[PDB]
Amino acid sequence: IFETYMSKEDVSEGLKRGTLIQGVLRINPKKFHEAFIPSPDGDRDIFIDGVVARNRALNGDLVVVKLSAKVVYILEKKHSRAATGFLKLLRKYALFSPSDHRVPRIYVPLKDCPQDFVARPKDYANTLFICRIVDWKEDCNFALGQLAKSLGQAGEIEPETEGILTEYGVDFSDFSSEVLECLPQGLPWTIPPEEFSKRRDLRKDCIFTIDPSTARDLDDALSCKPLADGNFKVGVHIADVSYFVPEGSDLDKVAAERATSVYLVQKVVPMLPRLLCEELCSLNPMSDKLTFSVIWTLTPEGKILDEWFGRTIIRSCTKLSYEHAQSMIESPTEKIPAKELPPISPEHSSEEVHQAVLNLHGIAKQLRQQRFVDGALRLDQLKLAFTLDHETGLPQGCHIYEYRESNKLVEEFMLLANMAVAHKIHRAFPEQALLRRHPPPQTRMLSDLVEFCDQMGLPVDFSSAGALNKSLTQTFGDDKYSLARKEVLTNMCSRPMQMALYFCSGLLQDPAQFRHYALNVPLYTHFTSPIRRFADVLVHRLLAAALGYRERLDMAPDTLQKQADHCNDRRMASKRVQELSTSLFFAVLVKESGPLESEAMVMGILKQAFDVLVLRYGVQKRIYCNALALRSHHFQKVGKKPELTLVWEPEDMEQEPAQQVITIFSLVEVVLQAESTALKYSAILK
RNA sequence: CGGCGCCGUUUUUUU
């Protein structure tokens, strides 16, 4: 296919005789079948056409051409020889396609690909990987590459993470010696013989969990049983943490201080010791676990007929993921091969799990439709996620987070359980329930948004959460830029929004303030994850006291409010840390993958800077005007609509400077560049 | 409304 590179001595001889030319090759970023090099003497560049006549040279390499020319030798390879792209199947190879079309397509051997990739390849259809080119044979149109696992260098990533953690007050040290003495000290733990009498034994039922692929601990489980008259019996089963954490111990004090678990991209800073978090409390499959359950009989539409709260002993059958449950929903009348599913206990079959998934999905769909008919608000934006290596636990790939039917299925029943427990504990203890609320947005900014939308010709209503949801729903269909424009408008509409708060009901004396604005419900609380939240442990204690298992808590409403305030602060800090870790690893990706060119839509304009939204990578970056080669810049607010005009510094002294006006919803082109020595990156408007 | 004329502000589920 390609021509063999020439000998160095003949290249030197040809340079001496003068019939060969040197230069730097540049490839057209739009028509990839042509490239050129600057002329040594003439004004017109030397042209090389096609990819064969380019002869495996990449963009930026210093080459020798022979005369209409052709590359015959490369002196110094200046290109990084690293690319970012997507994997797919075509056997021993997988295909890797880069985002830059000046780089060829690369074979990656299957043993380098992720473990789950061969069985469920469609899970990795939009996951972004780095591949380094190690060869390019003469007889192949495809380079041979190596997939780059373990994004970054641990020598430099860890100090950055430590600084991020330290600037927010996250305690990440080891648990004390007195904390570990409050744990059970025995041999591999077994349930005491005196618990089987006071609990409900559900070890014979079919119960399972659905959680992310990178799940660390498991907090909740589901079961569904079809009844004889067309109804269903559905149960939600929560790990029993308050049994292992006695009130007033060093373990209790440390968990109260940390108040939440922090989930970094590469590790976790937990709230409880890894003996509990990983072995005794986590609902691992095929082990007798103590849980606390809520059980309903539901009509096929989702109506509650009777309700039961209790303590149970369960034994999970399988561990599903959000991509495993989705394959069940989308195949209602066909067998899923076991090779595409996780292991299951011999006591239960795969069909008894598939039928339960479908029967839960139908009810969840009905509940979701009715909830959005009753006037609920959903205000979600884009987010970014990373995959991990099974052998070591280091990130290697990066994709855009997707919300699907499995997520909605789990969310509906978690919401229903949370509302049920909220009502139960609020009836039981009016002055000590730990609830969660959300106030209505700010009036101030609303006028500015409605005026701006009227001027831009976007009819948006803000009288109610349901009207606002409908207004955001109807945004010029689902064209290429319709989704981006919806993203920008959602980002603008989420600015007047306020923040949700934990609180103790014994201090708010107005029933109208208990409401949750975005969900449009009179009462709410958090109940379904006590391992990674301490408010959940508190409500578990409260409900156990409500059912008569223990005595009423001695803790006061003032102490409950103080702990709620602490939980609010730590949840805020955890959110910021979890965002900054994703920013850090995307900076690592940019640094190792070179500068990335893309298209962006302006989300905001400031006096000397403007935010953009990188459409290809789903990230938001701010561009500063002082960092560009501009003759000048000016800012003008015409009514309520802002505008920024830029006058480029001309490259030469005969033509007039170019003026470019940028306004919101406009389209620009940007380049992402890695900083010299740091894990940061910048956006350049050129 | 705040912070220093210039900047800051979100809901839900799982981990």
UniProtKB/Swiss-Prot annotation:
Disease entry from the Swiss-Prot or TrEMBL record: Perlman syndrome: An autosomal recessive congenital overgrowth syndrome. Affected children are large at birth, are hypotonic, and show organomegaly, characteristic facial dysmorphisms (inverted V-shaped upper lip, prominent forehead, deep-set eyes, broad and flat nasal bridge, and low-set ears), renal anomalies (nephromegaly and hydronephrosis), frequent neurodevelopmental delay, and high neonatal mortality. Perlman syndrome is associated with a high risk of Wilms tumor.
Record note on what altering residue 271 to K does: In PRLMNS; uncertain significance
UniProt-listed SMART domains: RNB
Important for catalytic activity (site feature) positions: 219
Lineage: Eukaryota, Metazoa, Chordata, Craniata, Vertebrata
Residues with the N6-acetyllysine modification: 88
Subcellular location: Cytoplasm; Cytoplasm, P-body
Entry keyword annotation includes Nuclease: yes
EC number, UniProt record: 3.1.13.-
Family per record: Belongs to the RNR ribonuclease family. DIS3L2 subfamily.
Positions of Mg(2+) binding: 211, 220
GO-annotated cellular components: cytoplasm; P-body
Name of protein: DIS3-like exonuclease 2
Organism: Homo sapiens
Superkingdom field: Eukaryota
HAMAP family for this protein: DIS3L2 (MF_03045)
InterPro entries, sorted: Dis3_CSD2 (IPR041505), DIS3L2 (IPR028591), Dis3l2-like_C (IPR041093), NA-bd_OB-fold (IPR012340), RNase_II/R (IPR001900), RNase_II/R_CS (IPR022966), RNR_Ribonuclease (IPR050180), Rrp44_CSD1 (IPR033771)
Main location (coarse class): cytoplasm
GO annotation terms (biological process): cell division; miRNA catabolic process; mitotic cell cycle; mitotic sister chromatid separation; mRNA catabolic process; negative regulation of cell population proliferation; nuclear-transcribed mRNA catabolic process; polyuridylation-dependent mRNA catabolic process
Gene Ontology MF terms in the entry: 3'-5'-RNA exonuclease activity; magnesium ion binding; poly(U) RNA binding; RNA nuclease activity
